């Protein structure tokens, strides 16, 4: 299963301000669930672009209706990868959870591009939710079927035996 979502936003600010804010986004009052963020690697490549990989830890709570299907999950590790190109004022960013991917993988691509004509920075986001676990439903369906079959096999056999004796 794959679900795609997209959104766009315009920050009426320049590239230096938006990109600097991205690197210093935490902490902020809107994301109290971000427990920490570390810079894992950073360098300037041969093309003069800044390459950065960061690691975030975020707490959360599973929806009530999910709890039975899934084990206890209160936090997730997230990788954040970015490339800043000062030549064309473009910053590509990507994030995805590192753990729990067997249950659900959430990948986000958000690009910030400065637009000289409007003196603003446009942010285009694309998020993909992927999973083939189906909340482990297949196995639960198999269990139900196995139990139902066994139950019916016995009831059918014993019921027939009972009736045969009554008539006999």
């Amino acid at each position: 299963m794959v679900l795609l979502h997209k959104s766009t936003h315009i920050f009426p600010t320049d590239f230096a301000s938006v990109s600097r804010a991205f690197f210093n986004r935490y902490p902020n009052p809107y994301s109290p669930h971000v427990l920490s963020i570390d810079t894992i690697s950073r360098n300037v490549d041969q093309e003069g672009n800044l390459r950065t990989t960061r690691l975030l830890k975020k707490s959360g709570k599973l929806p009530t209706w999910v709890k039975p299907f899934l084990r206890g999950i209160t936090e997730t590790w997230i990788i954040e990868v970015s490339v800043v190109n000062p030549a064309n004022s473009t910053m590509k960013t990507y994030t995805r959870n590192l753990d729990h991917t067997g249950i659900m993988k959430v990948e986000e691509y958000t690009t910030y591009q400065f637009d000289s004509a409007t003196s603003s920075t446009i942010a285009d986001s694309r998020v993909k939710f992927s999973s083939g676990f189906n909340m482990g439903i297949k196995s639960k369906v198999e269990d139900w079927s196995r139990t139902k079959f066994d139950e019916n096999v016995k009831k059918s056999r014993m019921g027939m035996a009972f009736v045969i004796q009554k008539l006999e």
């Binding site: 690197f23 810079t39 690697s41 690691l55 590790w77 000062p86 753990d99 990948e107």
Partner: protein, 75 residues
């Protein structure tokens, strides 16, 4: 003045010093085409040494190592 923490508490102060140095370099040098080198080497290496030591003991390390070999922008 509350700074963001490192996942390893013992590395938070080092992270604060590195981030501060990086922010100045980024805005004053990198974005202005004045530098492409690490003028925050001392702060960076002290910090990453701390983080790497902590990562060795984290269950997420294998997943992180794998992700670092991937190229999301498909390079």
């Amino acid at each position: 003045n509350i700074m963001s923490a490192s996942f390893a508490p013992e590395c938070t102060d080092l992270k604060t010093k590195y981030d501060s140095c990086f922010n100045e370099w980024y805005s004053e040098k990198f974005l202005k085409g004045k530098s492409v080198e690490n003028e925050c080497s001392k702060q960076w290496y002290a910090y990453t040494t701390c983080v790497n030591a902590a990562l060795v003991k984290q269950g997420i390390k294998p997943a992180l190592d794998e992700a670092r070999e991937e190229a999301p922008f498909e390079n």
